[PDB]
Amino acid sequence: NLTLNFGPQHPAAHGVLRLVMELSGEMVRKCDPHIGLLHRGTEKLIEYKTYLQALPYFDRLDYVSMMCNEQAYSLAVEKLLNIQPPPRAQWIRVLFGEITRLLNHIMAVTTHALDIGAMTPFFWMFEEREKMFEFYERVSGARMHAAYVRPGGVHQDLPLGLMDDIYEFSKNFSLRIDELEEMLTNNRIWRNRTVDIGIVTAEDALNYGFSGVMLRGSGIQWDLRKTQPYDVYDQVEFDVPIGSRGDCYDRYLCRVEEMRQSIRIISQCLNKMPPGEIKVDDAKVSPPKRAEMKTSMESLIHHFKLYTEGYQVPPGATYTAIEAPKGEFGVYLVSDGSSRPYRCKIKAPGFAHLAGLDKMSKGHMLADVVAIIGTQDIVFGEVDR
Amino acid sequence: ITVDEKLDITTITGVPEEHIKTRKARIFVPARNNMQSGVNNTKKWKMEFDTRERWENPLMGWASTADPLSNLVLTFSTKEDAVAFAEKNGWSYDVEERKVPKPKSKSYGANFSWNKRTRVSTK
Amino acid sequence: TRPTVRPRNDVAHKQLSAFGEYVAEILPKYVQQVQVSCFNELEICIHPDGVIPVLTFLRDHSNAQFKSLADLTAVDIPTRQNRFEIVYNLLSLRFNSRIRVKTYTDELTPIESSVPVYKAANWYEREIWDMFGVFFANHPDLRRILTDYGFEGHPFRKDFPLSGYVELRYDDEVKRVVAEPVELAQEFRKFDLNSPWEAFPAYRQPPE
Amino acid sequence: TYKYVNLREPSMDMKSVTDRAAQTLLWTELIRGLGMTLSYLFREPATINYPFEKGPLSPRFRGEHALRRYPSGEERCIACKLCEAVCPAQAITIEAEPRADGSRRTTRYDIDMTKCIYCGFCQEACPVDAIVEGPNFEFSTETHEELLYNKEKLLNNGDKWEAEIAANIQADYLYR
Amino acid sequence: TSVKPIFSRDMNEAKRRVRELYRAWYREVPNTVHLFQLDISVKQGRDKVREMFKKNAHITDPRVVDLLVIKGKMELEETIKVWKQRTHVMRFFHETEAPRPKDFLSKFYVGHDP
Amino acid sequence: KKTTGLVGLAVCETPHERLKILYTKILDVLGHIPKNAAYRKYTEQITNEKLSMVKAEPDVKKLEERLQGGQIEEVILQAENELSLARKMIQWKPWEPLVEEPPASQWKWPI
Amino acid sequence: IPHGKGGRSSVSGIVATVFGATGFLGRYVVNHLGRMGSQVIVPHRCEPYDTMHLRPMGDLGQIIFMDWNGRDKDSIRRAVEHSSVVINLVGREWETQNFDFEDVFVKIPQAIAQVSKEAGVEKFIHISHLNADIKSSSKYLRSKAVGEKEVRETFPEATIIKPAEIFGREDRFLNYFANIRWFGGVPLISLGKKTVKQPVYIVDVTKGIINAIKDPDARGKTFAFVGPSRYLLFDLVQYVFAVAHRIGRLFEISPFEPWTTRDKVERIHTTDKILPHLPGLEDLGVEATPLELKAIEVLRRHRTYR
Amino acid sequence: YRKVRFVGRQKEVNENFAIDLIAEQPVSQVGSRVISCDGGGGALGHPRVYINLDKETKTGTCGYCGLQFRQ
């Protein structure tokens, strides 16, 4: 049998993920991919840093999420430190935490529609995506990778503006999602390109430990978005999509309705924000203000020491996970009792979502296999967990 | 079950390259950076290996170096498992001893005497 | 006490004190310590003789579904006289409850793996072999994932230093990309950060 | 809650099949839809002519390093080493010394612009507000041997401009 | 030792296993030398095979040798197939590395006793 | 209905007696275990609790209430595996006492 | 003064200067000099792109590039004013359409026998050839021995190295064979009389320099390069077609980089196994390389497997 | 020794120096006891610090402030 390794080929998509194919003439029936192109030494590296200093290495763990990562870290630290965050701060973590889902669910369709080979829905949506990075630069520090969420809540307040901008932005977005509905849904060939492909629906679709979509849209109703709270996140109203059967085209149609939920939540979140503060007030965790660290005596000693070493975290293990826009996000943060943490093991999606490519692939073509991968939305560097 | 009780001193090898027989470890107590007087940084045995050369990197003057280990300190619990870790991987070492001070006898009131010498002034 | 302090609750602290109690009652063969976390988490310390059946007991029931294997991790702890610590984390689907399984072991002593019990441990179980050398029993395919082909280190333990020994370079001496002993441009200056004076009253050690 | 999408049984009668028969046979689909949504070509191309035109920014945008000083030159840096201890890449290296006047200053001052991961914490750690991430992306030399910035780049680079820097701090220091 | 072994019991299921895969390496050394398109002599490969087995012969304890068996067998998984693209097999030979002195007068002129 | 909600199963076929065999299928195997472990004390408790509400009342939809599983065909799977659970309770012996107590200081966290 | 391991990023004391260093010989020598670590100062003639493949041998700050002609003086003086040792290997084959080609082996080694020597250098080493004799053969082979004596007046102690014919990867002499895909493969010249010379292997060439660069005491005592065992035969030309189974030129092509039906064809068929009283290679040890093992590498033709 | 790395590289060097530029300042005077130094402006520059000026009429540039302060 021919043993071609169609992978390292820089054939668009993402020139990585080099695997083997022991194809039985035309059908595959055996797929054993290799990973480890970026191992980077991540989990060993954090063992020498402090809590505030290690924080951007959670940010660079995806390619896409900037505020959904570091959402799974501060909320994994504030439980250890007996802190609730202040109420103005929680309305921003839901706002940017429900704006990164309008970055994955744009990239999760276009990049899938580029491996397939369509050109024009790649350029028709990233030109609208530019209207959104101006937000990131205006609020935090940079284009994408922002050390913005801290353990002491939000870093700083978003400036004057950004409320007649987001309302200006979000009132003209549903026309753009009505474009791709005409581009892909009512079309037949793309429907014929993906129906009854990847029919994985049994209880081994959950014994493989999958997280969301490539879940509930295939069947079993469950999510971490209204059975487990984060912040002020249950006080808004929305629904969660479910597809019919257990193929890719009934996990594709989650993502059209999923983007039709984030517009509602943003248009529901803006009406409910109170004026208030930014940081936690007790200042053993938050740094004091700049106009304060130049006047009093108490401000500097709880400033100058708070950057030489970090916080004082109590011992005892902990664990949590939140909704990453492609899955769960496990962090088993072992604390020791000093400024420097102990072991920090992460669970990212793709461990389950790509080990189950063995079950999902066989009985099918070779041209099916590239169409499988862009449905799970697998990003490397994120499989470094 | 297949218990097969047997006895051997566990010396494991093959995982490093050559630095088993080359180096010698050191087990000691860190004892009170004496710019201040906090005694929390006692109670834990530590280790540190041999120190080798630090030259000048002739473009900046940085402390570039060989000596690939040079920074490995672990946190031990006591003297008992201090030895048992150095033998389980099996390279040479040398052990210090814990120093605890005098208790000691200090009492105010004897600083004002009728005939003694213990007498303070100029306070 | 005030705002900006996490409001704890007692309802989940009650049932998780209730549920896990009669778990040790109905298998006093493998369970050696159960503890309740002060924020609604549970540990069931298990000697690894019962690595398969206790999972197999939590694999199925009518009062405990627990069929969502989320997290297999591995934590090393030197100065314990049995180093390593395999820790699971599993999820009840129907009940919204988290519970972890802490099973210690040592290096050379193997562990009966969870291959028939769960099929999400296909790539997780191999990872501990590549990173520590903990040889699980009866796995159908043990291989090398997430490391390079020539390492001999199992790096995620503590004796492996920060850099390796294997700083790689190219020469045009013939064609090859050859290995070499490691050479840095900078020390990685190691600080000293542990302040004294014991900020924590509750976790105070036995003073001996 | 729920929603059951793509869950709809067909019509299956006499007349509505003629809507599904004219679709496949004469292609009233795929041209009314996909030949009109492409054209849609008459819109204006939103392209920036980069060597002439430039895009928007923010007043808190990061970039090139620089050092400031007081009115008539004083070296605002006080060498309090705090930017060093929070640099995640340890791109800072400072050796200080008592200068003969008496006040302490610097001797070596380094930013590994290769290693520099741009966490910007140096800008938010100096008490006397010395180092500033200057907003100019002018870069791209030709050697690795050049981007290691010594001190006499940075004071010069902090003095190619100041009115660019001094207006952005003065419009943003009230927030932080 | 209150610990169960891996494969062997005591030294005799062990020492027949290290002899076993030696033949699998021995027919492999002429097999790969024309496959990976590298150019040395084939007897050097057979010398380096027995170089590796003989060096670790100072073991008087089971399940460590058995631990090296799992290490020794996993080497063949990449080896019989093509998973080491012309570099990892060349990594066995410290070829372009400068020679260590290993002599006392020779160490003394160069180095702060490395 | 023709789809059972949870995709991957089929309504196959009859409620109210496919269950009623399988509860009683367990209870006969339940008597085989020597009674010193409390495994019998709770498992026979909930099956008699279940089968009393199972046998035998209309409708299918009413049997969903007061029996907290998924749909009724999936409630088979709630006890399908439980039959496979209790028969292996004879094979290994959890009613035996504790074995291999840890060496007296291991589950102490701060090193 | 030296420091630590000389694996990479060391100092090792020495500061050399290698001219030419764009051909087959001068590149491969420096690729050892950036391994032990030193200030290698290589000035190139007129080629910014043709040194691009050279740079990833010296780590960082170890190499440096300058421009020089050679008929100018200070460009050969400004660079060499801070060094310790200096070798030279400059020269080539056939006369240029613009140059003079005689004094290039006379005044150009003299142009760096200028104030260069006076500046304070030591262990200056030039290259020779084993066959460069004062006899009336050839136009290129002789007029190389003229530089061996008329420039030997300057630098009274040098240890000028004398190599034999070399074989490596991309030389001219061994690649003169098997680049002869033609309507006839003729040897030189249909006779097995004098073939062959001593093909020393290229690792032995670069190893002889680095032992001599702090030997010590190797100045004036000139050295010769032993070849393989032992003379060689006519079989070499048959050895080519048996196992082979029968850089700044221009934008399209160079008009004249020929096979040169001139005194090129005789400069190799003039063997001259010269005097064995030179020490010259085994004493500058250790160099011992056969031919039969390194022949698989350089030859590359259409079969590639069998 | 190091003088070869910049040949044809012109040695881009600083021009002004703050080694001595304090000394050209009109050294301030008050005739009081203790003075604030929020120099460079409020909420920027060096923090507030109080100096005794009784003894060879000076303060000592406060370290932080840098400007020569006296009476």
Ligand SMILES: NC(=O)c1ccc[n+]([C@@H]2O[C@H](COP(=O)([O-])OP(=O)(O)OC[C@H]3O[C@@H](n4cnc5c(N)ncnc54)[C@H](OP(=O)(O)O)[C@@H]3O)[C@@H](O)[C@H]2O)c1
């Ligand atoms: N050991 C042997 O068997 C053997 C065989 C044949 C020849 N040689 C001679 O020994 C040395 C080996 O050279 P090679 O094998 O590496 O080939 P090569 O290409 O001739 O290398 C020698 C360098 O000298 C340069 N050069 C020629 N004329 C020059 C001039 N007027 N000014 C400055 N540079 C000039 C050449 O090109 P650039 O100008 O671009 O730098 C070349 O880079 C040469 O001198 C050669 O004549 C030796």
Ligand code: SF4
């Ligand atoms: S920015 Fe602050 S820490 Fe850095 S050199 Fe200046 S004064 Fe020192």
Ligand code: SF4
């Ligand atoms: S700019 Fe970034 S990398 Fe550089 S010192 Fe500041 S925080 Fe560290």
Ligand SMILES: [Zn+2]
């Ligand atoms: Zn002042």
